[PDB]
Design an enzyme around this catalytic site. Structure first.
Site, PDB file in Angstrom:
ATOM      1  N   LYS A 348      38.539  19.139  38.618  1.00  0.00           N
ATOM      2  CA  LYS A 348      38.100  17.755  38.762  1.00  0.00           C
ATOM      3  C   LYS A 348      37.710  17.148  37.420  1.00  0.00           C
ATOM      4  O   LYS A 348      38.091  16.011  37.111  1.00  0.00           O
ATOM      5  CB  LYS A 348      36.921  17.684  39.733  1.00  0.00           C
ATOM      6  CG  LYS A 348      37.226  18.219  41.120  1.00  0.00           C
ATOM      7  CD  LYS A 348      35.953  18.425  41.925  1.00  0.00           C
ATOM      8  CE  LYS A 348      35.286  19.753  41.599  1.00  0.00           C
ATOM      9  NZ  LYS A 348      35.975  20.900  42.250  1.00  0.00           N
ATOM     10  N   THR A 349      36.953  17.895  36.613  1.00  0.00           N
ATOM     11  CA  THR A 349      36.484  17.368  35.336  1.00  0.00           C
ATOM     12  C   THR A 349      37.650  17.043  34.414  1.00  0.00           C
ATOM     13  O   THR A 349      37.629  16.029  33.706  1.00  0.00           O
ATOM     14  CB  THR A 349      35.542  18.369  34.670  1.00  0.00           C
ATOM     15  OG1 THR A 349      34.532  18.774  35.601  1.00  0.00           O
ATOM     16  CG2 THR A 349      34.882  17.753  33.446  1.00  0.00           C
ATOM     17  N   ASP A 402      29.578  13.954  36.040  1.00  0.00           N
ATOM     18  CA  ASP A 402      30.206  15.149  36.579  1.00  0.00           C
ATOM     19  C   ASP A 402      29.160  16.150  37.052  1.00  0.00           C
ATOM     20  O   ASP A 402      28.070  16.269  36.487  1.00  0.00           O
ATOM     21  CB  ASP A 402      31.122  15.795  35.537  1.00  0.00           C
ATOM     22  CG  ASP A 402      30.371  16.252  34.308  1.00  0.00           C
ATOM     23  OD1 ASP A 402      29.505  15.492  33.828  1.00  0.00           O
ATOM     24  OD2 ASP A 402      30.645  17.368  33.820  1.00  0.00           O
ATOM     25  N   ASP A 403      29.516  16.876  38.111  1.00  0.00           N
ATOM     26  CA  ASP A 403      28.630  17.853  38.739  1.00  0.00           C
ATOM     27  C   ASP A 403      27.347  17.176  39.227  1.00  0.00           C
ATOM     28  O   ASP A 403      26.239  17.461  38.771  1.00  0.00           O
ATOM     29  CB  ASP A 403      28.327  19.009  37.778  1.00  0.00           C
ATOM     30  CG  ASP A 403      29.001  20.305  38.190  1.00  0.00           C
ATOM     31  OD1 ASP A 403      29.999  20.253  38.939  1.00  0.00           O
ATOM     32  OD2 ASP A 403      28.529  21.380  37.766  1.00  0.00           O
ATOM     33  N   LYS A 430      24.069   0.395  42.086  1.00  0.00           N
ATOM     34  CA  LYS A 430      24.131  -0.935  42.682  1.00  0.00           C
ATOM     35  C   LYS A 430      23.496  -1.994  41.784  1.00  0.00           C
ATOM     36  O   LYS A 430      22.900  -2.953  42.277  1.00  0.00           O
ATOM     37  CB  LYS A 430      23.461  -0.945  44.054  1.00  0.00           C
ATOM     38  CG  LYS A 430      24.170  -0.115  45.107  1.00  0.00           C
ATOM     39  CD  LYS A 430      23.191   0.421  46.139  1.00  0.00           C
ATOM     40  CE  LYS A 430      22.378  -0.699  46.777  1.00  0.00           C
ATOM     41  NZ  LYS A 430      21.122  -0.998  46.033  1.00  0.00           N
ATOM     42  N   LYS A 507      42.290  26.939  38.262  1.00  0.00           N
ATOM     43  CA  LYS A 507      41.450  27.577  37.252  1.00  0.00           C
ATOM     44  C   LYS A 507      41.334  29.077  37.490  1.00  0.00           C
ATOM     45  O   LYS A 507      41.154  29.844  36.537  1.00  0.00           O
ATOM     46  CB  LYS A 507      40.065  26.931  37.232  1.00  0.00           C
ATOM     47  CG  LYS A 507      39.140  27.473  36.149  1.00  0.00           C
ATOM     48  CD  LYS A 507      37.755  26.850  36.225  1.00  0.00           C
ATOM     49  CE  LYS A 507      36.823  27.451  35.185  1.00  0.00           C
ATOM     50  NZ  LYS A 507      35.464  26.841  35.211  1.00  0.00           N
TER      51      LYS A 507
END
Ligand code: ATP
Ligand code: ATP
Ligand code: ATP
Lengths: 539, 107
Positions: A348-349, A402-403, A430, A507
């Site tokens: 994802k990263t 991330d994470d 927001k 990975k």
């Protein structure tokens, strides 16, 4: 006849001062400061306006303040400016600082008293003005010497007596600490901001700093300035001047032999040149900016590149392109958001970083949890606040988070986590930026259900799925792209795996292959299969 | 070359003699920098201190071309007790984040 001796030197040319990327700032300063002194005096007297006697400049280190001040001081046809280098006025005795300040405005007073309206112009320059002037009462323990200096300065600039022939210039890096009563109109009116340039400004600076070399034919024929202007991103004027000097030094270093016992200069100094290789080496080794994100981060976040092992790798990038286009074009939705999702060990990263890279936006930053190890809750909150504040300043910006599941400490037992960080995120997702500016936020996580349970998934505009390798054909494609096994072994691998369904993250595959390679040549493939068999699956 | 960071977990029943085997493996590695991060030297420390001492030992290891760092009794390091259960969360987060931080390029 009291001839109106122009306050502008007869031989003055804008190109002479050699400043680039600051056309608008100079135009505004000239309009609001020196416009009243150039037009014939009769009309001005009819209007009845009094001249301005103040300028303030501030900005981040290395943008060109002192250069403007020196050039302005040299432009006017007036007496030599009085320059103060920081706190030169403080003194140990009692009542000597105030006298040192009063000694600056002596000539102005005497000349105004003698010659009245028809008098010359007196300039005074303050440097690092935040060292002596500060909010009154904030300091405590100085014995009272940093509280009468400000009073004397205020009483002198504009008091019961009135002067009309001075001009005070101030420079600072922390504009928020200066006294409020010193910034009202009539004392220090024109407040300017000096900031980083854009592409055109960088090209102007790079042309200004190479004219001498270009004139004498010491610059090679293959040096294209546009490429350097494009490649140097986030550089500030000082860095752009330093890079050229580094290249020049690396060019001159080829004719000196210093390893030998005595320094000796060859006589091939004739036919000297500066080639593009020197510029590339200087970029790659010596000079590195101090703002934004650079290659040193994208090198670490994307360690092994991107390989197209299937269809989804294109779908994700296409969706990112659509989102970035929507952010850039439209005007009714300044703030956009997205979420990246998938099982662990999916990549994802890497995809988030790649999309951010290909966005091509002026400002990019990454907020990962591995730069704040051991921090408490408040430190994390303040760091996030600072990053987002720095993101607000620019025109259009992109930010990556991330994470998320470890930014707020989550552990299934309990459960346990930090409420403060969750509230901070829920409030920051927001908040629209100041008018006329755009922001994109990307987020990565590995547990959707927990986020749904906390009611955070309702603040994200949309979500994108990141699938995992699922079929033997995709595995064979990945192996052939990586190319670690030969065709003879690849035949057995296909004969075995194709009669089964696989479930393994990308990975993990690299680690499996690397573990397999350690064995002897004859026992490699077997071992690999064994490991895959032990991996199992759970769709 | 692809993987500059690898890790392994030795596990077994109690009184089986596992820390000695880890020490032997580390000693036979023949790497230049070999250090043992054990709870014997963190008696009475609060969470903040355990975290900062762990960080220092893991920072000293980024300034050598090769290294090997041993962690002992991961259970005692978290202050785990079967009742509740009860333990420390900050130390666990530190560990979970510190097993994925790749070293500076080339080590
Ligand atoms: N617009 C520009 N055109 C050409 N050269 C520039 C420009 N801006 C900066 N430079 C180069 O960088 C130097 C900038 O130094 P300057 O004294 O202006 O910095 P500063 O903003 O006062 O910094 P500090 O934060 O250290 O007080 C200039 O002397 C020149 O060498
Ligand atoms: N198609 C691909 N997409 C993403 N990463 C890829 C791809 N091919 C190879 N890689 C490599 O895989 C690694 C991606 O690991 P990454 O840090 O993104 O894992 P992750 O899914 O975020 O992990 P975790 O679930 O443990 O948090 C990088 O080395 C990247 O170079
Ligand atoms: N083959 C062997 N393997 C392990 N230990 C051995 C072996 N032969 C002798 N010993 C000795 O056995 C003892 C091993 O104890 P050790 O410190 O490893 O306990 P432990 O399993 O970590 O204990 P605990 O689980 O109670 O914390 C040491 O004295 C070691 O010298």
């Amino acid at each position: 006849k009291e001839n109106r001796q122009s306050i502008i030197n007869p031989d003055w040319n804008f190109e002479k001062m050699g400043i680039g990327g600051l056309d608008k700032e100079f135009s505004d300063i000239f309009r609001r400061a020196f416009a009243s002194r150039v037009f014939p005096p009769e009309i001005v007297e009819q209007m009845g306006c009094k001249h301005v006697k103040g300028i303030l400049l501030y900005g981040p280190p290395g943008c060109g303040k002192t250069l403007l001040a020196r050039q302005i001081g040299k432009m006017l046809n007036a007496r030599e400016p009085k320059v103060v280098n920081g706190p030169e006025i403080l003194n140990k005795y009692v009542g000597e600082s105030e006298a040192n300040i009063r000694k600056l405005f002596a000539d102005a007073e005497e000349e105004q008293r003698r010659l009245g309206a028809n008098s010359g112009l007196h300039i005074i320059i303050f440097d690092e003005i935040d060292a002596i002037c500060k909010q009154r009462g904030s300091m405590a323990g100085s014995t009272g010497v940093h509280d009468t200096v400000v009073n004397q300065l205020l009483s002198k600039i504009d008091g019961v007596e009135q002067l009309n022939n001075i001009l005070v210039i101030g420079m600072t890096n922390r504009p928020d600490l200066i006294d409020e009563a010193l910034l009202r109109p009539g004392r220090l009116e024109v407040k300017m901001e000096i900031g980083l340039p854009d592409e055109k400004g960088r090209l102007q600076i790079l042309h200004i700093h190479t004219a001498r070399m270009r004139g004498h034919q010491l610059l090679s024929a293959d040096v294209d300035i546009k490429e350097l202007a494009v490649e140097t991103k986030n550089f500030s004027g000082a860095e752009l001047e330093g890079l050229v000097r580094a290249a020049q030094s690396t060019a001159m270093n080829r004719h000196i032999k210093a390893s030998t016992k005595v320094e000796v200069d060859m006589e091939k100094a004739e036919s000297l040149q500066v080639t593009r290789g020197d510029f590339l080496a200087s970029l790659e080794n010596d000079i590195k900016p101090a703002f934004g994100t650079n290659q040193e981060d994208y090198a670490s976040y994307i360690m092994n590149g991107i390989i197209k092992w299937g269809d989804p790798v294109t779908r994700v990038l296409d969706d990112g392109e659509l989102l970035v286009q929507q952010t850039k074009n439209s005007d009714r939705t300044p703030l956009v958001s997205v979420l990246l999702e998938g099982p662990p060990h999916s990549g994802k990263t890497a995809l988030a970083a790649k999309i951010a890279e290909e966005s091509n936006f002026p400002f990019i930053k990454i907020c990962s949890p591995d730069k704040m190890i051991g921090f408490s809750e408040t430190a994390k909150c303040q760091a996030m606040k600072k990053i987002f504040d720095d993101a607000y300043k620019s025109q259009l910006s992109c930010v990556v988070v991330d994470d998320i599941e470890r930014l707020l400490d989550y552990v299934p037992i309990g459960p346990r986590f930090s409420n403060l960080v969750l509230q901070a995120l829920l409030v920051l997702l927001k908040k629209a930026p100041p008018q006329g500016r755009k922001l994109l936020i990307i987020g990565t996580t590995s547990r959707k259900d927990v986020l749904q349970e906390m009611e955070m998934l309702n603040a994200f505009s949309t979500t994108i799925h990141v699938p995992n390798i699922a079929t033997g054909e995709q595995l064979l494609e990945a192996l052939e792209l990586l190319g670690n096994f030969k065709d003879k072994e690849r035949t057995t691998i296909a004969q075995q795996v194709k009669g089964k369904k696989v479930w393994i993250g990308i990975k993990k595959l690299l680690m499996l292959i690397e573990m397999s390679l350690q064995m002897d040549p004859e026992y490699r493939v077997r071992k690999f299969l064994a490991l895959l068999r032990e991996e199992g699956a759970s769709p």
